[PDB]
């Protein structure tokens, strides 16, 4: 019984914990429009709001 308890934790530890991340198969090229958004300033904007 105690060997079972020990091996479940071992299987879990060796499989590892990971963080799921979304994908898209119809995108096999994304640095046809990713490169334009990247590396210069065209710009991501500090959001503000008109007060007067």
């Amino acid at each position: 019984e105690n060997d079972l308890k020990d091996i479940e934790a071992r299987i879990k530890e060796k499989a590892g914990v990971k963080e799921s991340d979304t994908g898209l198969a119809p995108s096999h090229l994304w640095d046809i429009m990713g490169d334009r958004q990247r590396l210069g300033e065209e710009h991501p904007l500090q959001v503000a709001r008109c007060t007067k």
């Binding site: 709001r49 007060t51 007067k52």
Partner: protein, 72 residues
Amino acid sequence: VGVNKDSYLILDTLPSEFDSRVKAMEVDEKPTETYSDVGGLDKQIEELVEAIVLPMKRADKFKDMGIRAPKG
């Protein structure tokens, strides 16, 4: 006031700030509903005109009378 960001010096003067919710209190071409949407209860109307509208416009007579303005 205005202050130049790069090196802090008064650039200019500017009018005083107001908070955004307070800037929409104003009219923007508000529609009128005038006394043509009101039938019955004339007495109420008369009291309203005397209290509010006429001490604004007839504000000199009020000083003549020797009394202080209404706050509401």
